[PDB]
Amino acid sequence: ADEIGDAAKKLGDASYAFAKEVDWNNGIFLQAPGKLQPLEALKAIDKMIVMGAAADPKLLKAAAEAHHKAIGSVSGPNGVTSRADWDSVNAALGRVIASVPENMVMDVYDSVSKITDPKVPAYMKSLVNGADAEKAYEGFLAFKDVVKKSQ
Amino acid sequence: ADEIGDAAKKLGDASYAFAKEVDWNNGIFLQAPGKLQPLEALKAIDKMIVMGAAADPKLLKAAAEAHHKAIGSVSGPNGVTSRADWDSVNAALGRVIASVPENMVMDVYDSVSKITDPKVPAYMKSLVNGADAEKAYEGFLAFKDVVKKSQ
Ligand SMILES: CC/C=C\C/C=C\C/C=C\C/C=C\C/C=C\CCCC(=O)OC[C@H](CO[C@@H]1O[C@H](CO[C@H]2O[C@H](CO)[C@H](O)[C@H](O)[C@H]2O)[C@H](O)[C@H](O)[C@H]1O)OC(=O)C/C=C\C/C=C\C/C=C\C/C=C\C/C=C\CC
Ligand SMILES: CC/C=C\C/C=C\C/C=C\C/C=C\C/C=C\CCCC(=O)OC[C@H](CO[C@@H]1O[C@H](CO[C@H]2O[C@H](CO)[C@H](O)[C@H](O)[C@H]2O)[C@H](O)[C@H](O)[C@H]1O)OC(=O)C/C=C\C/C=C\C/C=C\C/C=C\C/C=C\CC
Ligand code: CLA
Ligand code: CLA
Ligand SMILES: CC(=O)O[C@H]1CC(C)(C)C(=C=C/C(C)=C/C=C/C=C/C=C(C)/C=C2C=C(/C=C/[C@@]34O[C@]3(C)C[C@@H](O)CC4(C)C)C(=O)O/2)[C@](C)(O)C1
Ligand SMILES: CC(=O)O[C@H]1CC(C)(C)C(=C=C/C(C)=C/C=C/C=C/C=C(C)/C=C2C=C(/C=C/[C@@]34O[C@]3(C)C[C@@H](O)CC4(C)C)C(=O)O/2)[C@](C)(O)C1
Ligand SMILES: CC(=O)O[C@H]1CC(C)(C)C(=C=C/C(C)=C/C=C/C=C/C=C(C)/C=C2C=C(/C=C/[C@@]34O[C@]3(C)C[C@@H](O)CC4(C)C)C(=O)O/2)[C@](C)(O)C1
Ligand SMILES: CC(=O)O[C@H]1CC(C)(C)C(=C=C/C(C)=C/C=C/C=C/C=C(C)/C=C2C=C(/C=C/[C@@]34O[C@]3(C)C[C@@H](O)CC4(C)C)C(=O)O/2)[C@](C)(O)C1
Ligand SMILES: CC(=O)O[C@H]1CC(C)(C)C(=C=C/C(C)=C/C=C/C=C/C=C(C)/C=C2C=C(/C=C/[C@@]34O[C@]3(C)C[C@@H](O)CC4(C)C)C(=O)O/2)[C@](C)(O)C1
Ligand SMILES: CC(=O)O[C@H]1CC(C)(C)C(=C=C/C(C)=C/C=C/C=C/C=C(C)/C=C2C=C(/C=C/[C@@]34O[C@]3(C)C[C@@H](O)CC4(C)C)C(=O)O/2)[C@](C)(O)C1
Ligand SMILES: CC(=O)O[C@H]1CC(C)(C)C(=C=C/C(C)=C/C=C/C=C/C=C(C)/C=C2C=C(/C=C/[C@@]34O[C@]3(C)C[C@@H](O)CC4(C)C)C(=O)O/2)[C@](C)(O)C1
Ligand SMILES: CC(=O)O[C@H]1CC(C)(C)C(=C=C/C(C)=C/C=C/C=C/C=C(C)/C=C2C=C(/C=C/[C@@]34O[C@]3(C)C[C@@H](O)CC4(C)C)C(=O)O/2)[C@](C)(O)C1
Ligand SMILES: [Cl-]
Ligand SMILES: [Cl-]
Ligand SMILES: [Cl-]
Ligand SMILES: [Cl-]
Ligand SMILES: [K+]
């Protein structure tokens, strides 16, 4: 047990209602988040690849395992994993994030932002309950504070 | 040095002409290989996630590093990495493939085949020199024989 795991349970309390509202089977998630821009997108993928190579390989393995288990508990009309598996994925990802330097994480974020059209967040939010999305994000903010402490 | 590395150099002799002909900046590679089928695609991703969790985490790290370096040597009008980085990526991937049971690898292959429209290979081949694609594939066949010996 660790503090990221405890923070993941609070994150689940804040964010699972939102996860149940997302239609995970919508094909839109395969499309670029705006205009397809291969050269800029490759720069973002490169920052991810750098981060993945730097991450604790054991924590990467555990995060992959948590997603395998999560796939197994998918149910209902939107393809949402169970509450327990949601929390397990989020904890495992938090551990991976904490295992690399903050710069690496910020470089992925900035590089993905560069290819994301300004309308995409509002469009995604419009498909779910906006107050639940807001609660989920406020949950994320608290969670990342715990992740940073462990980083 | 190892036998996968030696086999990767022979693979490069057979396949680099083909890699130079592919337009790596074509946006088509973001689309599903046929009809977008989220439920079946998730099954294929699940088999990949199982395989990634089983792979030697050190060899996964080295494969990610080889791709970072490869991105750095991209040049020319098609976005092709250097010959040396092509071989380095292929060796590193061969090591990852050899680090898991053959079943896991075949399960990814079969699961991806299930979502790949029968026209996709011929369409991809039609964009390059068909004899160079054939040489590349004959190269792959020899390479995977070395990978299997190490597996
Ligand atoms: C063949 C290739 C195969 C596959 C292709 C590969 C990849 C697909 C590539 C791209 C598709 C992926 C993602 C893009 C898709 C979807 C995008 C998903 C992300 C999103 O929607 O983000 C919304 C967010 C909104 O802005 C925030 O608003 C805040 C408001 O806060 C106030 O009010 C609150 C309540 O309202 C609270 O009360 C608070 O207390 C109060 O403070 C503050 O103003 C913040 O400063 C401000 O940041 O926007 C941004 O962060 C920047 C945009 C994009 C970054 C993009 C993404 C995140 C970055 C990195 C994630 C890492 C990786 C993503 C990718 C993959 C995951 C591994
Ligand atoms: C939001 C989500 C984000 C991203 C989405 C994520 C993923 C994208 C998902 C999918 C897109 C990916 C791929 C699909 C895209 C493109 C497809 C790329 C693959 C392709 O084109 O394959 C062509 C191949 C042709 O068939 C072979 O013909 C042979 C002929 O051999 C003779 O003649 C020869 C010379 O002519 C020689 O002389 C020889 O000596 C002589 O023997 C034999 O008959 C073989 O028995 C027969 O197998 O087809 C198949 O293998 C099955 C089809 C698809 C499997 C699909 C893929 C491979 C499987 C696994 C690869 C693993 C993973 C792929 C994916 C990713 C890689 C990590
Ligand atoms: C089928 C399998 C699968 C699927 C469908 C996904 C889907 C996703 N992954 Mg995951 N992932 C997988 C397997 C999968 N992954 C595997 C095998 C691994 C390796 C172990 C990872 C490792 C991984 C990492 C390291 C990250 C992702 C992230 C993401 C998201 C990227 C787009 C995004 O930011 O949306 C928005 C995100 C969500 C809807 C997820 C919930 C986010 C918080 C907790 C609550 C919602 C807040 C707010 C409303 C929206 C996000 C704002 C943002 C600024 C934080 C998306 C939800 C990224 C992510 O979520 O970035 C924010 C991310 O950082 N994945
Ligand atoms: C921007 C980065 C990037 C890009 C663009 C790609 C692109 C690709 N990856 Mg790679 N990968 C990356 C980073 C990247 N990867 C990273 C960071 C990792 C983790 C370390 C991986 C790990 C990985 C694995 C484990 C595998 C791939 C494979 C593939 C291919 C999947 C589609 C396919 O089969 O086409 C066809 C494939 C090619 C054109 C590549 C050359 C294949 C041989 C050597 C020669 C050509 C033979 C023939 C003409 C066509 C293929 C037939 C097939 C049955 C073998 C595609 C070329 C897969 C692959 O190639 O499956 C066959 C695969 O198994 N990737
Ligand atoms: C081979 C392999 O290993 O694959 C595995 C690799 C990983 C990394 C482990 C993995 C993973 C995670 C991944 C990739 C997550 C990707 C998330 C992508 C989210 C994409 C979104 C939100 C895309 C869009 C596009 C939109 C477009 C919206 C608009 O155009 C619309 C409609 C109308 C316009 O007028 C205005 C507009 C508003 C602009 C939008 O609003 O949102 C996975 C899944 O496991 C696969
Ligand atoms: C060996 C191997 O194969 O590894 C493979 C392993 C994987 C995992 C499969 C893999 C991969 C994918 C990877 C690495 C993904 C990385 C994801 C990173 C996500 C980062 C995020 C969300 C960062 C942020 C930063 C934010 C900042 C927000 C703020 O600053 C803002 C705006 C304003 C401030 O006032 C408040 C604030 C809140 C502070 C935010 O909101 O979010 C890959 C590439 O395939 C390689
Ligand atoms: C088709 C289908 O059915 O697909 C199904 C597939 C599944 C897998 C079964 C499934 C599922 C679950 C999924 C996708 C869950 C996704 C979870 C994503 C979690 C992401 C996390 C936590 C990312 C971060 C990034 C962080 C960054 C933190 C920092 O940068 C910040 C901000 C500020 C810096 O100063 C300090 C910092 C600390 C560096 C962080 O702390 O965390 C589902 C829903 O069922 C759908
Ligand atoms: C080849 C093939 O077929 O592969 C298949 C493989 C798969 C895995 C099966 C597959 C899949 C599924 C995938 C990747 C799913 C990814 C899902 C990502 C969902 C992202 C969502 C919901 C994003 C958001 C962002 C929002 C932002 C909200 C806010 O920021 C806003 C506006 C304003 C702020 O003030 C407050 C805020 C509230 C913070 C929100 O509310 O939501 C797919 C697509 O089928 C393809
Ligand atoms: C977030 C993160 O970590 O992301 C990283 C995760 C990884 C795994 C490390 C990673 C990787 C590798 C990946 C995903 C490779 C994906 C390869 C995909 C190849 C897709 C292809 C060939 C798609 C098509 C679609 C086609 C459609 C053709 C047709 O429709 C057409 C035109 C006309 C129709 O009439 C007939 C038709 C013929 C049917 C086609 O012919 O081919 C990467 C890139 O690093 C990102
Ligand atoms: C911890 C963590 O995060 O790990 C992350 C790590 C990654 C790597 C980023 C990641 C990923 C992606 C993964 C695993 C991809 C796996 C790719 C597997 C590719 C398999 C291939 C091509 C298999 C085959 C089999 C073939 C067979 C051909 C033949 O049988 C045929 C027809 C006919 C016979 O007569 C001749 C023959 C020739 C014998 C073939 O031709 O090809 C993921 C999911 O993101 C998780
Ligand atoms: C936009 C842009 O510019 O992107 C740029 C991004 C880069 C990275 C810089 C770049 C590059 C390079 C790239 C993509 C290289 C891709 C290489 C893929 C290699 C895949 C390999 C080897 C896969 C396998 C699968 C195998 C399976 C073997 C077996 O199953 C087989 C058959 C039969 C079983 O009985 C035994 C077995 C042994 C189990 C194997 O042995 O090997 C480029 C080109 O510049 C484009
Ligand atoms: C959000 C966002 O923007 O992300 C961006 C991220 C990136 C990384 C920048 C990105 C990218 C690039 C990517 C994934 C590139 C992947 C490329 C895959 C290429 C696959 C090719 C060539 C496949 C083939 C198959 C062929 C088959 C030939 C044969 O089988 C045939 C018919 C018949 C047999 O008898 C003989 C044979 C000869 C064996 C062939 O000849 O070729 C992208 C797309 O821009 C999206
Ligand atoms: Cl929807
Ligand atoms: Cl571009
Ligand atoms: Cl082309
Ligand atoms: Cl389906
Ligand atoms: K561009």
Ligand SMILES: [K+]
């Ligand atoms: K289906």
